[PDB]
Enzyme design. Structure first.
Site, PDB file in Angstrom:
ATOM      1  NE  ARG D  61      -3.271   2.423   2.931  1.00 43.07           N
ATOM      2  CZ  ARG D  61      -2.967   3.312   3.876  1.00 43.07           C
ATOM      3  NH1 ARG D  61      -1.941   3.144   4.708  1.00 43.07           N
ATOM      4  NH2 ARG D  61      -3.714   4.388   4.027  1.00 43.07           N
ATOM      5  NE  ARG D 108      -4.890  18.587   5.939  1.00 42.55           N
ATOM      6  CZ  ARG D 108      -4.338  17.684   6.747  1.00 42.55           C
ATOM      7  NH1 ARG D 108      -3.952  18.015   7.974  1.00 42.55           N
ATOM      8  NH2 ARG D 108      -4.171  16.442   6.327  1.00 42.55           N
ATOM      9  CE  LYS D 244      -8.694   5.181   3.072  1.00 45.47           C
ATOM     10  NZ  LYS D 244      -7.530   6.145   2.953  1.00 45.47           N
ATOM     11  CB  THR D 302      -7.031   2.164  11.119  1.00 42.95           C
ATOM     12  OG1 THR D 302      -6.940   2.665   9.772  1.00 42.95           O
ATOM     13  CG2 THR D 302      -6.560   3.280  12.071  1.00 42.95           C
TER      14      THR D 302
END
Lengths: 519, 515, 509, 505
Positions: D61, D108, D244, D302
């Site tokens: 990955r 952000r 995802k 994760t």
């Protein structure tokens, strides 16, 4: 349907049950899985203990691998001060059990450079001498390491592996001497004082119950502890030894056998038979046997304890990262949920509550996860299998228990209220794993504390005096339970609840089940 | 060892079958009600007492025949026989009375002025059907009168007409305005006043005729327990029967008889409107192909079990026993499989009304039902009934399923249920426990109507109501205990489940030993 | 809509029952074999042709009566009728021949009213054999006293009369159930271990005649133990080694020793007539369901017999109990159903055959295959046999794509038998060049045997393909399926028995 | 019964199954669950990559949240050098896939002046470098359309919490606030584009670099998947898209995302910020369940072995998590910082291998197979009927493998969805199929490099024999054992219709 995972509850297959699990389906208020918290510097104050109780602590565990009797006695005093601060209103009072966890046959290293908190960094591909010479028992460092297992040399061989500090430091035996072992560091890292040592290859020959354990168990009896978590139980005779040491004065203290080595897993059935319950002590277990096999041992033991109707505790590193961080890892959230889904009666916190920076947050997180996982259980199949695998008996108490649980599912009851002297009646209901919380009404304070070992039991301690007319004493306690459920938001006026009572006073006569509306 | 308990423990239905054991005897209790048609073979008080001893639970009176005077006599005899056992309350058995309507029947006339005369119809021969009443007592091999005046309007050339339990078949060749010319397909002996079926046709007779209205009102006057309503095609037919019974007969149970294609098609609305169902397989197996009747039977029993409404399997179950002292193997099988299917009751018609061996036929149904009840796979049955039943906030429903669960756990000798209306006992019965349900009631009609439910053994308490409520409960529970012990259902030291109210709503389950 | 496929999809048995629909028509294929007893009503070549057209798969000959010349002529007419359809191999239906033995018997002598409560002496003294009466009854079973005890029951004349033994060359009895006693009546001893020979002297003669006559199977009467089956097998010998032996279970000992009997036999008949004399009539359904279940678990054929459509001896339509009995035998799992008097001597032999056909086809659609196949698998041992794994794979695939058929090439029948034990909904078209295999295949639920008479093709793989194509033509011609439907095909990797290992999902061309 | 948890396998109930799990019952050699390793400074060298392969990595990955195209190109080159270093022996050669994981759409904050109450969130670009304890600038222009009074806002991987062209907020959980930090909006329908400008360039790079699959970040709805698919285009049509699921909208619209996608990643990190962390296990188990039901690959991701970034052994929670992912039904398990940056990358790979193999033996196939079938649609499709027949046969004869010839992988995917115990050896001549096959539980892909034979029947036989040789060399089975073999009736994709039970030669 849209709450408590009731849509998933109605699935005809386990796969479809999984498919219907809904993050927007909120759980009930009641949390069924008991939370055992290890108490230490981070959680030992009366002030903090009150908050630990409010956050969901059901059992305070004292680990006798550390600390003097003076220290533990003060911790115990503080637990009781915190717990009894809520005693003025019995409707809201939460019983809190006290658990003594034995040192048992441990191996530990000495002091790094004379201090309990000193450390040296062991670089890999270095050489380290282990000694039994007490001259160095407080002078451990990068080059020499004392440990307290006098007879170690007889049970190890060249090439044997020695693990230190939660199996993280790894050593290989190169040579043997009269009272030493020369080793090379296979996996390095920081080396502190008085760390746990494992010899997975070897048959360690320490006593099941040492002089220190005898002292500690005496102390436990003197201090009126509710249960003993007995370390390193290898066989039924170890359990019987602890039971005999506790003797007649400690006859009502529950013995939970900790399974932490290969022999304990092998002899599990006889250990279970002899014990009041079991702890899956995963810390050492995952050093003594390959870490990749722990989940098999865990699920085997939880399974077998569920079949036997005896309490089982999942222990160690469940929210480990929360020692330093305010929130757990995803693997940790998963572990707690899966321990509940496996069938564990209780879940446990060690360093997370004893020494860590976020004890209250760790308790609160176990509470939130357990409650979500309890709703996600596939009761349809679980209850079917528990019924099928249960011994067929002419025991009237068992028939009343199974009837009550069947009834609780049929009317989606807000609770099962059980009057019990010894706890046994409520334990019998718990064994069949109802969704509904079991409110166990007792006048026996010890019963109230010990009942926390069982999934689903919410023990409540009636302090109303005994009524002349027994039937009216029975109704008084039932109404007490109604007041408790209402105050804690388990149910409200008009909801239906199940009520278990007996036909005469004394233990062993529970035979009456009623389906009643809440007043 | 007993009660097929080894087969009961199998984890698959196939292994359950493999473990059925001819050397594992059943319990004394028999759960499936036996309904017996009363006629000249079984009407005397003397013979009715033996019918009761042999196992009859419900006496059925067929109003296709007989005057009101005659039926009032039959009913009086049933009550005289039943009450002859009243002097020992422990051994008294309630007996229900059922009125079975004539309904929209089609019948032929008399062969040559005689009730017994017959003529031979030969395959390929011609036979003229007439509506001219001059021939209503002059039927023969050439001309056949029948009583359905509108027949010509609902058949066509090529239509088939069936006579006498569908054994004689005719094909319409020519339609007149007041007559039909037919060819005999299946011949045989043609007698007097035989039933006629027109499977292709939409028969236009009233669901409830003037005669049915008279008979239903007579039923109310005579305090019958239930009505078996013949030829129900749709919910509105049931509503018409219910209307006639009216407020005075509002507690009389209406069992709709399904015996034609439309009845099967409209089964769900019929079931909703009825108190229960009879699978009336005689006419059903003429109205639809005979090979399809077992599908209709299993469908209707399943749907009745799902709804918790009584279902009766009827007709030709022990047919050979009209003439012979023992049944055929197909008949033994039929009775057993009716019980395995889930039928609350089984029925006898000619076997008890007119045959040579009425007592033997009742005794045989008793023996087979008891064996079949032991052979039920309760493990799966109970799991499915629970799954398919609604979970609701009704405390009596939860107490009922709890009681059944508890009875399986301690393999109880009985579930004793104190009940005024019967409802609590009916609620227990719908979950099909293995243990007999001893329903203790002071209400005579409750006790009689309880026979409609699999597993209910009704007992009628005649003692006055005691001053203290706990003592009055104990009196009734101990009465059930004495009955169960006298009947061999259980003995001192066994465990039983007891359902009562908690205070003076059945919501209390106790697990108690037999004293 | 069709074949009860709504009911098929139910998640519970109860809901499966609730969805059974009299207006959901079945498929053409009827899976359950029909065995017809041949006699005066059905023995003519012309009636036998209609019997075959109406659905008869096996002609049963009852050797309790009739000379060898008589039965030889019946067999000859069966074969004449059967081969009248041989010209078209696509439509030809094999018909099997079964020999049903007289077996061991106990008989009374020549003679009166036996009254309940009266005492009757049973004598073995040959002096009273033509002189039987209310007080002394001669029987021809020399060892009777050895197998009965004080308290034992003795039935006489098909269970009409019942006696109980009170003292035990003689037995003093009390008449429990009385009636008119006649001459040469049949005797049964409930619960007794009867030690009569496995085969009588007459049986030996009849079995040897069965070998001469090339019968497909023997229905062996009154089998009590595995050793009885071994004796029948011995008599048939090397010449009769491929004749199937179906053991008739007729008494308590046979039920009790069922497992050993089944192991030694090729199949079982639940002989309900005599079984319900030997055991209480109300228990016969338990014995039937136990034996059918156990045969289903072993993959061996089981036949339900006796009185299935009894009233049709005299009437053109059966009783409601009779319709139910046939449907329930199929639902229980019976591979075959049987007709005795209904076809041997009755007035309506063709109607009786047609009715068994109609009921069986309806009942086959009403099977809850979802549960049935799930259970058969769980109870099916893991073995290393490739044919067994190929067979279960084929049945699973047949459910997944609701296939029109499972086509199986087979020499001996075994590969087709292995498919049949898993109870597919789809018909099993078993294509064979062995005529005896084709006839014997009728013993197994779901097998429709077809006899390929085409020459062997010069490339073996082309010869395999030819036989598969023959089965496609049979299915299309018989309306089992049509061009475009999906079928499962089973073949092997080399010639010879025992190599079936290949499952293909193929379109009907 | 003493190996492979075969005693537990035979239990009639799941409780008894659990009771029979045996730490002394050794697993077989085969490990079915694909292991996806994130590559970074700890694991990027050719020499370390070779060891990663030997230790069990199936998918490399690349996390495009950081690193230049030049950097990632070099990583891919090193992956291929390491992988092809084993290509001389084609019997033992293990395909290794390359996955591109997108940066994806982000919110952000701006540049500070760290600042440590009330707090104004402004979209005024004048405040975009003057961020402080009073004013916080964000780059999501539409934020005010998706938030409402009371809506929560998380800043810096969930570290900081707030309750609400301007927004006024009260800090719920305080902390040190740096510059350019990630923002999450629990429950909000973020309308950022499916694909950012950077993503468009990165996805083009993936196509040029011949990647096997894209892990597409922050997928909220089917239309997002369609946009990724459109950017990849005809040139990228055979690249698998794994969506995802990272937030509440993605979980709610899961069914439509699954339908549009080739597979799913349960992106548990961001998911447990967007929803309460205590509910993540519900979302994981639901998504794995629905992916198993659809027969599409699902990845658990994760913090699976997070402590191994710093330590040579994992925590007991981490061992449990990996095992439970496999028992849940996950086709693949993933490592992020454990292999990208940590001190023990090889030990982390080895531990996932060990745990997965133990867990696969502990699966209760008896109920699992029964249920997959009941939920299996009856269709006319021959390949599906062949696949389920093969799996049933493999259970009946306890086969050492199911061997499947496949061009596109599809025939082997169809077998995988029914979850056999036996390994599925997928023999293909297509190198990309061999790499992509790792996404599916049970598939052991082998790349046949034998020359095509003129007679197709011989060419088929040659490939079956190749699989026999792989299985013998890898210890899956031995001569005389029985295996299942799937083939088709003609060349080309789509014709698998033949199941054979074959002895190993």
């Amino acid at each position: 349907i849209q709450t408590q995972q009731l849509h998933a509850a109605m699935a005809d297959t386990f796969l479809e049950h999984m498919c219907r699990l809904d993050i927007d389906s909120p759980p009930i208020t009641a949390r069924n899985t008991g939370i055992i918290c290890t108490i230490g510097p981070a959680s030992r104050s009366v002030e903090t203990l009150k908050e630990m109780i409010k956050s969901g602590m059901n059992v305070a565990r004292l680990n006798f691998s550390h600390g003097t009797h003076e220290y533990h006695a003060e911790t115990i005093k503080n637990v009781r001060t915190a717990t009894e601060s809520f005693a003025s209103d019995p409707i809201l009072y939460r019983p809190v059990a006290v658990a003594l966890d034995t040192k048992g046959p441990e191996i530990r290293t000495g002091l790094i450079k004379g201090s309990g908190t000193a450390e040296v960094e062991l670089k890999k591909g270095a050489t380290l001498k282990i000694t039994l010479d007490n001259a160095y028992m407080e002078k451990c460092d990068e080059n020499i390491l004392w440990l307290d297992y006098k007879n170690i040399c007889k049970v190890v061989e060249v090439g044997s592996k020695i693990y230190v500090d939660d199996g993280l430091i790894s050593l290989q035996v190169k040579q043997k001497g009269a009272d030493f072992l020369v080793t090379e560091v296979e996996n390095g890292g920081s080396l502190g004082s008085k760390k746990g040592v494992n010899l997975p290859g070897a048959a360690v020959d320490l006593p099941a119950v040492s002089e220190k354990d005898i002292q500690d168990l005496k102390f436990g009896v003197e201090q009126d502890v509710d249960m003993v978590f007995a370390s390193f139980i290898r066989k039924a005779s170890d359990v019987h030894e602890v039971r005999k040491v506790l003797g007649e004065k400690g006859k009502n203290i529950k013995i939970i056998s900790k399974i932490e080595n290969h022999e304990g897993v092998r002899r599990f059935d006889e250990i279970l038979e002899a014990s009041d319950g079991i702890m899956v002590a995963r810390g050492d277990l995952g050093i003594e046997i390959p870490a990749e096999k722990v989940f098999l041992a865990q699920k085997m033991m939880i399974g077998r304890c569920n079949r036997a109707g005896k309490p089982v505790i999942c222990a160690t590193q469940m929210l480990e990262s929360m020692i330093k961080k305010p929130r757990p890892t995803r693997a940790e959230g998963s572990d707690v949920a899966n321990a509940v889904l496996d069938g564990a009666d209780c879940i446990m916190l060690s360093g997370e509550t004893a020494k860590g920076d976020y004890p209250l947050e760790a308790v609160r997180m176990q509470h939130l996860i357990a409650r979500e996982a309890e709703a996600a259980i596939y009761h349809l199949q679980l209850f079917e299998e528990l019924r099928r695998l249960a011994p067929i008996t002419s025991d009237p108490t068992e028939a009343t228990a199974v009837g009550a649980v069947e009834a609780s599912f049929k009317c989606c009851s807000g609770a099962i209220i059980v009057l019990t002297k010894s706890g046994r009646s409520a334990h019998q209901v718990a064994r069949y794993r109802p969704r509904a919380p079991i409110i166990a009404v007792t006048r026996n304070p010890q019963t109230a504390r010990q009942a926390h070992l069982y999934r689903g039991i919410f023990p409540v301690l009636c302090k109303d005096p005994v009524q002349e007319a027994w039937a009216e004493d029975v109704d008084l306690r039932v109404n007490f339970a109604m007041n408790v459920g209402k105050a804690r938001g388990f149910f409200k006026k008009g909801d239906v609840v199940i009520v278990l009572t007996g036909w005469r006073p004394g233990s062993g006569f529970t035979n009456t089940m009623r389906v009643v509306p809440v007043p």
